[PDB]
Structure formats: structure tokens, C-alpha cells
Amino acid sequence: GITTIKEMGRSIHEIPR
Amino acid sequence: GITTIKEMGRSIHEIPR
């Protein structure tokens, strides 16, 4: 079946301040 | 005009297990 994986890292880019 | 019949036997093949 579907193997589930966690990802503790940043998922998207960081809109600068 | 729109004479109707009831067929009570199996209508389609039986997909095997």
C-alpha cells in the first residue's frame, strides 16, 4: 500500500521580511 | 403501447471471487 513518510523540514520557501 | 415485463433471473455475469 501507500508508504507514509514524515518530513520535519521546511516544506516551502520563506517569504522574506 | 408501453407494455412492460419483469425478468427476475440473473441479468449479468457473476464476476468470480
Next chain:
Amino acid sequence: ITTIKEMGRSIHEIPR
């Protein structure tokens, strides 16, 4: 076992 029949509608009706 107890087998009880239900003659009513079982699921919602998807509209036309």
C-alpha cells in the same frame, strides 16, 4: 444471529 430487513432508503439521493 438476528437478521432484520430494512425496506427504506439506505443512502442519500444524488440530485439530477
Next chain:
Amino acid sequence: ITTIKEMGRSIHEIPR
């Protein structure tokens, strides 16, 4: 500044 965590739901759930 003592922090406190809260694992409950924070805001209402918008219905589907």
C-alpha cells in the same frame, strides 16, 4: 516569559 503549550483545537472548524 513562561511558555505554555496547548494541543487542543485553537479555532472553530469551518464546515465542508
Next chain:
Amino acid sequence: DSQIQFTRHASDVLLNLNRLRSRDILTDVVIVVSREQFRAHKTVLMACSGLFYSIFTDQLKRNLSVINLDPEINPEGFNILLDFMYTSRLNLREGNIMAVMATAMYLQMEHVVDTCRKFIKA
């Protein structure tokens, strides 16, 4: 310990399945017959036709969205059998009863063939 049986459940599922076809929802195959086309659900086509059950189980022929029937097949005969698969209702019209019976043989729908044979008179 108990178990409940819903006697008209299967009838309600088929109606809803036809409503999805009616609104063109999750139709995953088009059946080309002569000039015209017919959108339907592969699961309903496999449940009802020995011939459609045969392609969509074949490994290579599973991921196809356009099925072309033999050019001899009458579209009007297929449409009558298609509406049948979704409604339990086989409408034999004034001039289609032989076409519907013939298309049913092609589609390996042997039970609908056998039923029409007991119906045809002359």
C-alpha cells in the same frame, strides 16, 4: 449480535451511479461506436459486460480511456444496453429489438440475450 439488510440499497446505488453518469462525474472511459461516443464508468461496464470485463482486466489494456467497438455495432443498440446497465430497464424500441439483441451478444451479455430470445416472437 445482529445484522441489518437494506433491501433497496443496491437499487439506490445504481440510481446514484446513473446520476453521476447523468451529470458526467468521474466518467473514466469513452466508448466509440460508429460516429457517436458514450461516456461511462469502467466499473459499471465491467460489472455488466463480459467483453468489457475482459479488456479492463488485461494488464496493458487497463490504462486506456477510449474503447472503439467494431464498426458494425449499432450505436442505437449500444445506447439501449448502456441505459440498461444503469437502470435495470431494457427499452426495446419499434426498430431496435434485433440490434439490441445483436449488440448484447457482442458485449457477452448472455443473460440479456437469453431474456430477449424468450421475448422475441414471430
Next chain:
Amino acid sequence: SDLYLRPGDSQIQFTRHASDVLLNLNRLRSRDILTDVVIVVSREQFRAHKTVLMACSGLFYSIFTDQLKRNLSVINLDPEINPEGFNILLDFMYTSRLNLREGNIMAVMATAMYLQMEHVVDTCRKFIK
């Protein structure tokens, strides 16, 4: 003499066609043929057909009527949903039979409530009388 085919316009109603379709739909499911979605319920997975789920569940109807999820293949339910309750209701969708026992009727009912299976809930309400 005219060997003409009968008077003409006629219609045949196959009473058990609806049942034979649903039974074959289950055989396709039990052999995992053309299952097009996997429901994830608390890290336990269930495969099914999207069309059968929409026909039965008001929730799965709302979900796959939506453009984002209409053509996708995975659905994660609320993690509170009991997997046993869903499996009991998925078997009802394909067999017209609801296998509630004493002790899980409360889970079966509250899961039917989540799936927006309105008529199945009411049959459980009267089944506490």
C-alpha cells in the same frame, strides 16, 4: 403471413439487476480491480471505488464533487474516526448488509454520522428500542 417481431415498443425490467451489479462491484473491490482511491483512517488504509463511495456517503460526495479532490487518489479522514467503524460501513456500501454487534454499534453509528450517511444513522437510532 408476416413474421413480424411482436407488436413493437416494449420494456423489460430486471428486478435483481441492481443486486447483481453491486455484488460484482464488490468482487472487483475484493480482487482490487479498478479501485481508484485509498482511504487512510488512522494509519490504516482501505481501497475502494470513488463512484461507490460517492453514491453512499454524503461526505465522500462532497469531497469528490470538489475540483481539488475529484481526480486525486488519496483521502485522509479525521484521525478521530474509528477504523473499525469505517470498515463496517464500507462493507455495507458494497453488500447492503450492516454487521453491527453489541459494543461497536456506538462507533458504527457515530462513524456513519461523520460520513453523512443520514439514513444509516436513523436505522441505528431505532435499533436502540
Next chain:
Amino acid sequence: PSSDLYLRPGDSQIQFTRHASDVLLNLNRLRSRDILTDVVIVVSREQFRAHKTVLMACSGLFYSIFTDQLKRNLSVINLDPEINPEGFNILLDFMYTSRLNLREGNIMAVMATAMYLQMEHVVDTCRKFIK
């Protein structure tokens, strides 16, 4: 076996555990830069630009206003004069940061403003806090 460089994990679901936090932070950066903000909330003397979608997500009051067709196209919202601009600023930051900052002498304000905005889960967390 080795002659076949097929992509190894056939079917897989990757759960980006912090994607929600990352999206909310970037929404806050867009707020701070006044990017695609659609409404200004006027609380007594101060003004707060924000995104109506984030407001409807968190507040039952804002959800109820921006829901009927007649009101979701509003540019300026005036909260009641009794609403503390400090209390609202604390809650608005919570909406964009998941962090509710309670300094001494503000906790009653935050709690009262949360009742106004119909954020009943925050309100209940504050009730647990006092006690």
C-alpha cells in the same frame, strides 16, 4: 532486477509536518508587508490591515460577516468602540503566529476581545489559564 531503474518507493505519502506553520508564517510576512490584504479592522484609535481569509479561519464573528454575499466585499470594518486596540492586536498576532502573548494586565482584555470575536477556543484556554 538491477536492469530496471524504476522509482523505488512506488506509492508514498509524504507528510510535511511543519508545512502548516510555514504557510502561516508566510501569510504573516505578507500581512506585515501589506500584500494582498483586503480589509482594514479599525479598533478605536488604531487600524489593522489583514487578510479576510485568515480572519474567517479564526474568528466566528468575522466568518459570520464575510459570509453573506452582501458583506464579504467590505473594505473597512469598525469594531465596537469598547474593543481594546491592545486586546485585538494580541489576538490578531495569535491568528498569524499560533502564539497568544499574555502580559500582566492584558489577560482580561484578551479574554474579553476573544468573546467579542467569537473565538471560543481561545476563550476557554484563557479560562483554564486564570485557574
Next chain:
Amino acid sequence: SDLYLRPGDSQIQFTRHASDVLLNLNRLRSRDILTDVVIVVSREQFRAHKTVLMACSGLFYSIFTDQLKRNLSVINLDPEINPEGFNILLDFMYTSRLNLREGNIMAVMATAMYLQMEHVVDTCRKFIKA
């Protein structure tokens, strides 16, 4: 004696708040509430919030920040972009779940390059191998 409250400062971190906000944004999207753009991908379309798109995609951020393209209502992607690939990525933006089924792994990855979602890409390389 005194019923004074807390004599100091304290911060309450609401875990799952961001998870609950995004789910409600997904609900607002599923109801066409305050959606401000449709993304046309070949023969398919998708309602979305330009705020969510800008948060997740470098490309959508690069476009909707430009003063001229700020108030755009329909965005047509390149005719090469795979809709099923983009559909999986737009679903990921609103759920935190990237579903890579055996059919279209390379499609999901390629669309993520096009969308300047380099963090998603680096994660497909991290786990999917040959």
C-alpha cells in the same frame, strides 16, 4: 488578601493552530469563498487563494507581487505543465500531504521545479530513488 492574577508575562503556544488555519482555508477554497484566482492548466482549472499560492510557490509569489500582475484573475500555466502533477501540488499546499503514486512521480517533481517549490523537490530526491 488579594485575588490578583498572574504577576508576570507568559506566552501560550497553540500547537495545531496552523494546521487548523490551513484546514479552514481549504474549506473556504472548497466553497469558493474569497478565492481570488483560477489556475488554468491545459484543459483543467483550479480555484485558489493567491495568498496560499504565494506562500507555497516561488513562481506565484514572483507574479502576484509584481505591481502590474497583482490584480490578475486568470493564470494560464505553460501548456506543457501536467494537470495531474499540478493537482497533487495544489492539494499539498492545502493539506501538508504530498501524494506520490506510482503513476506520476516525475510529473509531480517537474511541476514543482516549474512552480519554484525547491523544498518539495529536494524531498522527492531525498526519498525516491533508482
